[PDB]
């Protein structure tokens, strides 16, 4: 029911935009090194501007940016009150995507003036993979909407 997408955004700095639908908008974080299935790997995720739901399907070119593709898409569900979680700086959730699945955490720093800084972390479960054995970004690098 609630939409999720990850867009690979080839701007000045390559990054991945991670988006979760909540209350009619896409809550969004820029994750410069991309999501990681390894629970030991914490990935910087900088909260950015909410986006409209239909952007979840957008592929094309963004002026200053560069090319955008939809790298993963699906649904998400919170495992605890998502509104309270966003406010308090911890979202626990599960993903039902093409590439990403299983349980995840977004955790915000409590440091005053660094409130935009979160970390996306894979939770330990059947979908976790060690980074030295499987890097999801390398193994499955294509658009899920437009490949070939
Ligand atoms: Cl557990
Ligand atoms: Mn971006
Ligand atoms: Y509240
Ligand atoms: Y599939
Ligand atoms: Y392919
Ligand atoms: Y390719």
Would you mind describing this structure in some detail?
With 148 residues, the chain is mostly beta strands. The protein has one domain (1-148). 7% of the residues lie in helices and 49% in strands. It contains two helices and nine strands. It has helices spanning 82-88, 136-139; strands at residues 2-10, 14-22, 25-31, 43-51, 60-62, 66-78, 90-97, 101-108, 117-122. It has an eight-stranded antiparallel beta barrel with strand order 1-2-3-4-9-8-7-6. The longest helix has 7 residues, at 82-88. The site of manganese (II) ion (MN) has 5 residues, from strand 2.
H/I helix tally: 2
The strand order across the widest sheet is: 1-2-3-4-9-8-7-6
* Small-molecule components bound: chloride ion, manganese (II) ion, yttrium (III) ion
Number of strands: 9
% residues in beta strands: over 45%
Write down the domain tally: 1
The succession of helices and strands, N to C, reads EEEEEEHEEEH
Helix content: under 10%
**Radius of gyration, taken over Cα atoms and rounded to an integer in Å:** 14 Å
Question: What characteristic shape results from the CA principal axes?
Answer: globular
Determine the structural class based on helices, strands and strand pairing.
mainly beta
How can the largest sheet be summarized?
8 strands, antiparallel, barrel
Site (Transition state stabilizer): 51
Family: In the N-terminal section; belongs to the LigD 3'-phosphoesterase family.
Binding site for Mn(2+) 1: 9, 15, 17
Subunit structure: Monomer. Interacts with Ku.
Layout of secondary structure:
Layout: E1 2-10, E2 14-22, E3 25-31, E4 43-51, E5 60-62, E6 66-78, H1 82-88, E7 90-97, E8 101-108, E9 117-122, H2 136-139
Bound molecules: chloride ion (CL), manganese (II) ion and yttrium (III) ion (4 copies).
């Amino acid at each position: 029911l609630l939409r999720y997408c990850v867009q690979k955004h080839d701007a000045s700095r390559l990054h991945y935009d991670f988006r979760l639908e909540l209350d009619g908008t896409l809550k969004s974080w820029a994750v410069p090194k991309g999501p990681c299935l390894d629970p030991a790997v914490k990935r910087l995720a900088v909260q950015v501007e909410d986006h409209p739901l239909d952007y979840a399907d957008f592929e094309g070119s963004i002026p200053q940016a560069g090319d955008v593709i939809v790298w993963d898409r699906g649904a998400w569900t919170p495992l605890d009150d998502p509104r309270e979680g966003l406010e308090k700086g911890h979202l626990s959730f599960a993903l039902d995507g093409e590439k990403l699945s299983g349980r995840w955490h977004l955790i915000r720093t409590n440091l005053r003036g660094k409130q935009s800084q979160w970390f996306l972390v894979k939770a330990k479960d059947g979908e976790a993979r060690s980074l030295d054995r499987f890097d999801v970004l390398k193994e499955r690098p294509d658009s899920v909407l437009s490949e070939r």
